[PDB]
Every structure is written in C-alpha cells, then in structure tokens.
C-alpha cells in the first residue's frame, strides 16, 4: 500500500 503511513512509530 503506497498510502500507508511513511514515518517512524
């Protein structure tokens, strides 16, 4: 999914 969140968690 390209629209998945791109940031650290």
């Amino acid at each position, epitope marked *: 999914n*390209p*629209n*998945a*969140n*791109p*940031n*650290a*968690n």
Partner: antibody, heavy 123, light 107 residues
Framework: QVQLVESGGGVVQPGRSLRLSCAAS????????IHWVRQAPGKGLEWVAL????????YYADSVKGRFTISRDNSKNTLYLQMNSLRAEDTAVYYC????????????????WGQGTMVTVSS | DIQVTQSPSTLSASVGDRVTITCRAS??????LAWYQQKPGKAPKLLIY???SLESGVPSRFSGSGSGTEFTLTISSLQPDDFATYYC????????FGQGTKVEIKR
C-alpha cells in the same frame, strides 16, 4: 526552526543525469517519510516520489519510473533524487515535502515544503 | 488512477467577499483530501488536511467540507494576501493534485 533546502538544480542537457538533494534541519529527519514534488513552468503540481523514514519503501510516479531513483542518508539528514535520461519535459522546480504525520494509521498531507530547486533540461 | 478536478479554474473576487471552490474526485477518496495555497514562484502551503481539519497556524477564515467525491474549500472573507492559486490533493490512492483555482482580484 524546521526547514527543508533543495539543491542541485541547474541547466542539464537532455539524456544526461543529475542528482538533486534536500537537506533538513530543525526536526528529526530520520523519523519522517519525504516526497519529491515538481511543478513545470506554468503548470500544476505533480507528485514524483516517496521514500519511507528508513529508506525502505519507495514509490514513484509513472512519468518518472525507471529513470528517477529516490534515496536518503539519515546520517547527513539528506534526501536525494537521482534523475537519469532527462527529457525536456522534466524541466521543473523540484520540491521536497514532508509527510505531515497528522495520523499514524495513514499517510498524510504535506506540511513542510522546501523553497524548490529549478532544473532546466536544455542543450 | 484517481483524478481530482477543481472548479472553477479562475475565480474573480474582492477583499471581504466569500469564496467557495470545489474539488471532485473521479472515485471515492474517503476523507483523504488536502487543500494547499500557492503564490507564484513560492512553495505550496498546507491549509486543510483530512477534508475539514485546519492545519496549525492557518487562519480560521479557511474551512473545508466534503467526503467521498465532492469537496469544497471556503474562505469566509477574503483578505488581501489570499489572492493566490489553490490546489486540492487526494492522498487515498497515490498522490494526485487538481489543476488549481486561481483566486484573482476583481476590478
């Protein structure tokens, strides 16, 4: 203060290569996914590519796939866009833009933008 | 591919006027729509995210509405620095922006 600074733009001949970069300061760069977005003279905004915070997942627009490569060096707080086989229609201001991080369960609108770097593809 | 089209392409208005601009997605984007303001030769500025959420520090005269395929951006009363081009962007399937609505000074 949070800031994104693009560099590398200049006159480059068609068919040649150019490596843009985007240097971040004022925030934890290694925590954020970052996009490249471009705007051709007189035209609208066109998303180019996304890289994840750790440089793992990379997404490209169909117009640049196979010619452009996104990468990052978190130790230098820097993002790159290697452009190969440049065409005249790649002439544009190139922006780096941060995922806003409003929500952790989806990607977000682009909150922080750089000033842009102008790439002119001409012989 | 999801397309987003804005209407109108140019809007003429005066300071103090209210302006509502529209953005239509070719298929449902749920609430994943953002509004940006761009002045000529300047970096875009985020105004609204998730259809109606106001980005921090953006003046309260900007409001967004809509879901699914029909969305709108309203400026309650235009200020002199609001003359600009406005772009909507869907972040549901990849990233696509609209063609922009130029808000221009009427005379």
């Amino acid at each position: 203060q949070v800031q994104l600074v693009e560099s590398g733009g200049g006159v480059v001949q068609p068919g040649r290569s150019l490596r843009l970069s985007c240097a971040a300061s004022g925030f934890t760069f290694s925590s954020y996914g970052i996009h490249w977005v471009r705007q051709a003279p007189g035209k609208g905004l066109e998303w180019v590519a996304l890289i994840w915070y750790d440089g793992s997942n990379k997404y490209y627009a169909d117009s640049v796939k196979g010619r452009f490569t996104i990468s990052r060096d978190n130790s230098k707080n820097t993002l790159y866009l290697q452009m190969n086989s440049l065409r005249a229609e790649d002439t544009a201001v190139y922006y780096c833009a941060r995922d806003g991080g409003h929500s952790t369960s989806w990607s977000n609108a682009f909150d922080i933008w750089g000033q842009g770097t102008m790439v002119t593809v001409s012989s | 591919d999801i397309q987003v089209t804005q209407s109108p392409s140019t809007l003429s208005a005066s300071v103090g006027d209210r302006v509502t601009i529209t953005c239509r997605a070719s298929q449902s984007i749920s609430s994943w729509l953002a509004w940006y303001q761009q002045k000529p030769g300047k970096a875009p500025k985020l105004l609204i995210y998730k259809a109606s959420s106001l980005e921090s520090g953006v003046p309260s005269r900007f409001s967004g509405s809509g879901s699914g395929t029909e969305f709108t951006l309203t400026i309650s009363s235009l200020q002199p620095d609001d003359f600009a081009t406005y772009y909507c962007q869907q972040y549901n399937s990849y990233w696509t922006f609209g063609q922009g609505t130029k808000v221009e000074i009427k005379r």
